[PDB]
From Swiss-Prot:
Subcellular location: Cytoplasmic vesicle
UniProt keyword Disulfide bond, yes or no: yes
Function of the protein: Taste-modifying protein; intensely sweet-tasting. It is 100000 times sweeter than sucrose on a molar basis.
Claim: Zinc-finger is one of the keywords in the record: no
Keywords from the UniProt entry: Cytoplasmic vesicle, Disulfide bond, Signal, Taste-modifying protein
Protein name (database record): Thaumatin II
Biological source species: Thaumatococcus daniellii
Source superkingdom: Eukaryota
GO cellular component: cytoplasmic vesicle
Coiled coil (residue ranges): none
Cross-referenced PROSITE patterns: THAUMATIN_1, THAUMATIN_2
Length: 207
């Protein structure tokens, strides 16, 4: 499956793509404002994620740090990024269908649209100014808006026991972005697409 990753932000981002225990494609790349990077994701990929990283410095060996979303200091991510990270999430070719969503469970850094480029389903978007509106206690000084689990490490926010409810913090994310997951047990906003669809992830879609 191809994923066209487009940076419409006015700032550079470092895109990342992983399934947690491995890179997807090259795993990460710089995208200046306006740049597009197309990656290939193997059919059947389960639990894949694409995200943006901000304020990154890498040396000539591809090692450094990003102010949001850093993945073990690598340009080319193998593993998931450090919150806060707006997440484009997907599982492909699951009994004949693909499943896509956007999640704020790991916080928010950069606004995103995640849409099919092929027939048969609809896209999702979280493009509100979550960083600007972020509750004081959730603000990430590197930038971004942390989720409450990251900040407070409680069963209720992290849904560790499986019985959690919405919270004042989850409701903030849900108010600003109704079509993204706001906590683990949120009413799903996953979209079912045809198996083997292709996609575009656009950072700062309303830029």
């Amino acid at each position: 499956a191809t994923f066209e990753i487009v940076n419409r932000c006015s700032y550079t981002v470092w895109a990342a793509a992983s399934k947690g225990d491995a890179a997807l494609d090259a795993g990460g790349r710089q995208l200046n404002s306006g740049e597009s990077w197309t990656i290939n994701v193997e059919p059947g990929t389960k639990g894949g994620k694409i995200w943006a990283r901000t304020d990154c410095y890498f040396d000539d060996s591809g090692r450094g740090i990003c102010r949001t979303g850093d993945c073990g200091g690598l340009l080319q991510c193998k593993r998931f990024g450090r919150p806060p990270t707006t997440l484009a999430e997907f599982s492909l070719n699951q009994y004949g269908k693909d499943y896509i969503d956007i999640s704020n469970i790991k916080g928010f850094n950069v606004p995103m649209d995640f849409s099919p480029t092929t027939r048969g389903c609809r896209g999702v978007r979280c493009a509100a100014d979550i960083v600007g509106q972020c509750p004081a206690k959730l603000k990430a000084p590197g930038g971004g808006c942390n989720d409450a689990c990251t900040v407070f490490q409680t069963s209720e926010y992290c849904c560790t026991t499986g019985k959690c409810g919405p919270t004042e913090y989850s409701r903030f994310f849900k108010r600003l972005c109704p079509d993204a997951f706001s906590y683990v047990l949120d009413k799903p906003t996953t979209v079912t697409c045809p198996g083997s669809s292709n996609y575009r992830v656009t950072f700062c879609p309303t830029a």
